Enzyme design. Structure first.
Site, PDB file in Angstrom:
ATOM      1  N   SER B 111      -3.773   2.760   6.644  1.00  0.00           N
ATOM      2  CA  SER B 111      -2.948   3.536   5.727  1.00  0.00           C
ATOM      3  C   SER B 111      -3.273   3.285   4.253  1.00  0.00           C
ATOM      4  O   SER B 111      -3.159   4.185   3.406  1.00  0.00           O
ATOM      5  CB  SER B 111      -1.441   3.288   6.032  1.00  0.00           C
ATOM      6  OG  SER B 111      -1.006   1.932   5.952  1.00  0.00           O
ATOM      7  N   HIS B 164       0.427   0.822  -0.478  1.00  0.00           N
ATOM      8  CA  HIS B 164      -0.105   2.191  -0.607  1.00  0.00           C
ATOM      9  C   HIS B 164      -0.405   2.609  -2.050  1.00  0.00           C
ATOM     10  O   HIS B 164      -1.115   3.591  -2.291  1.00  0.00           O
ATOM     11  CB  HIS B 164       0.887   3.213   0.029  1.00  0.00           C
ATOM     12  CG  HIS B 164       1.098   3.059   1.517  1.00  0.00           C
ATOM     13  ND1 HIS B 164       1.986   3.844   2.224  1.00  0.00           N
ATOM     14  CD2 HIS B 164       0.489   2.264   2.436  1.00  0.00           C
ATOM     15  CE1 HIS B 164       1.906   3.538   3.510  1.00  0.00           C
ATOM     16  NE2 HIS B 164       1.004   2.583   3.665  1.00  0.00           N
TER      17      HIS B 164
END
EC number: 3.4.21.105
Lengths: 173, 182
Positions: B111, B164
């Site tokens: 991710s 992220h």
């Protein structure tokens, strides 16, 4: 007080790399550690990093290892080995990529990583004094003179990295 | 198979690992592929990267490999495998560090790298339209309907997650750098 394992193993290795190069010649060694200079070599992952381990001159290795001894030992000492390794890895890679992009896969040195240590150590001391880590006033410019010693971009990227994490780190508390 | 070698091997590697984790269970494989969790392992260098090989749920590895294949693919085709490897390496590193730093060593997933590819892809198309690369307006939005469908069309709290942003920052960095040459 002795320097930590990270800081030590880096120095010794770069001394052992300079070793081979002096004997076997710069050429032969880079043939082995250089940043992928051909597709055939693109999956040889160590290459994305091992180019830091190579110096071309006495002065080149001397100053890089002094900055790495001082900054790199302070970081590993106060913040640990993990903190040193990551700054090193990222900065080695970023800088390597910016160098490779603009001037070819033929380069070597621990100057990309040094600039990252200069931006990391300096920034934290300024933002997070009490953190214990800071760039001594006198040395700010034996290094800002090492920052202005070269005028480079494959050095900016590395600075950006050091600066980046240092911002993140003085961002926690 | 049209997807390049990098894109391809990474997907297969993730499936091969997910399978193994399934099997030996998540615990065992982490033992082997997790970011150094104890000083004794600090120098086992593969660990700083191999963490990106592990997923913990069907939906985890699914969307991950989807965006990887869509985005990773595009980059690799239009810009080369090198460009994709370095994006993969720097974003896996910077994002795993942030993670570890704030939340320990037990994690996984591709991710962090997806956030980097999205950022790059998007940013490059906006600055260098002609480079050929860009994030399909709908697609951009199947990320934005999403930062805006968890943030705006809300659900949890704010999915703007710890690891992220670093991953994104990397891609935005290299993109800004590649759209800077010409």
């Amino acid at each position: 007080e002795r320097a930590g394992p990270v800081t030590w193993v880096m120095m010794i290795a770069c001394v052992v790399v300079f070793i081979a190069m002096q004997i076997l010649g710069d050429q032969e060694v880079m043939l082995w550690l250089a940043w992928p200079f051909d597709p055939t070599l693109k999956f040889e992952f160590w290459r994305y990093f091992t180019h830091a381990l190579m110096h071309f001159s006495l002065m080149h290795i001397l100053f890089n290892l002094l900055w790495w001894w001082y900054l790199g030992g302070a970081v590993e000492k106060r913040l640990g080995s993990g903190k040193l390794i990551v700054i090193t890895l990222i900065s080695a890679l970023l800088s390597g990529y910016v160098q490779q992009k603009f001037s070819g896969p033929w380069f070597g040195g621990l100057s990309g990583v040094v600039y990252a240590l200069m931006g990391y150590v300096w920034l934290r001391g300024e933002r997070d004094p009490q953190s214990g880590i800071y760039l001594q006033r006198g040395l700010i410019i034996f290094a800002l003179i090492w920052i202005v010693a070269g005028w480079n971009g494959a050095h900016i990227a590395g600075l950006a990295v050091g600066l980046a994490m240092a911002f993140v780190d003085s961002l926690n508390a």
